[PDB]
Ligand binder design. Structure first.
Ligand SMILES: O=S(=O)(c1ccccc1)N(CC(F)(F)F)c1ccc(C(O)(C(F)(F)F)C(F)(F)F)cc1
Length: 225
């Protein structure tokens, strides 16, 4: 009920990202020149699928390991029952990772940050599902064509978690309110930055779900972590 407490929420959510920026954007941009040479690439291609999926599920579990803190520094988040605190992240934290990967994306050369270097999707010929791989590349490519800002990722990823239509919740009405205040806080900073035009350039609500869902099956056929 105050412009201060609304901006305070905006300023808060952006602070949670700055620490849970798993990667340093400065390093990401400064290392965008250091690229897996075709010799160094060819090493990854030999590995059987059972290797990369582990390496992938390792970094992903490590990447999620920074989403878990981020979720907990949000206003009123611990004021939920553990039921309505586990139901959220299991469905939500996965989609947050796919977002933060846009930071690690260089749409100039269509490359992504993998184990200290940048590499294309031929770095993943071993897995055997390039269509899913490419769809992730073009998805992150659909957020480089928006030139996202740090506080735009922090404010959108935060509204990926805070969904009240997640089944299994119990304190539902208690989640809607916290989602209301994040919708308005999101639109507000968009207005006061003249970036509200992207509200339609967004990938839909259903694209994010059908992406990692279509993948996490395959990650679970192998590692299941
Ligand atoms: O950003 S990643 O480098 C990545 C590379 C290629 C395709 C997707 C994502 N990495 C996140 C981290 F920074 F931790 F490395 C990541 C790797 C792989 C995944 C996958 O879960 C998979 F398939 F390998 F298991 C997938 F992208 F497919 F979902 C997710 C995130």
């Amino acid at each position: 009920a105050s412009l201060t407490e609304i901006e305070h929420l905006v300023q808060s959510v952006c602070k949670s990202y700055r620490e849970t920026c798993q990667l340093r954007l400065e390093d990401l941009l400064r290392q965008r020149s250091n690229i897996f040479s075709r010799e160094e690439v060819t090493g990854y291609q030999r590995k059987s699928m059972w290797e990369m999926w582990e390496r992938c599920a390792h970094h992903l579990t490590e990447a999620i390991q920074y989403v878990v803190e981020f979720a907990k520094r949000l206003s009123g988040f611990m004021e939920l029952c553990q039921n309505d605190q586990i139901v959220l992240l299991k469905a939500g934290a996965m989609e947050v990772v796919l977002v933060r990967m846009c930071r690690a994306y260089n749409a100039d050369n269509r490359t992504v940050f993998f184990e200290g270097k940048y590499g294309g999707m031929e770095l993943f010929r071993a897995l055997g599902c390039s269509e899913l791989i490419s769809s992730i590349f073009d998805f992150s490519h659909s957020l480089s064509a928006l030139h996202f800002s740090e506080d735009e990722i922090a404010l959108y990823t935060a509204l990926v978690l805070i969904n009240a239509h997640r089944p299994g919740l119990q304190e539902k009405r208690k989640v809607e309110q916290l989602q209301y205040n994040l919708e308005l806080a999101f639109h507000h900073h968009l207005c006061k930055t003249h970036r509200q035009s992207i509200l339609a350039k967004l990938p839909p609500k259903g694209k994010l779900r059908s992406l990692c869902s279509q993948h996490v099956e395959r990650l679970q056929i192998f590692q299941h972590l």
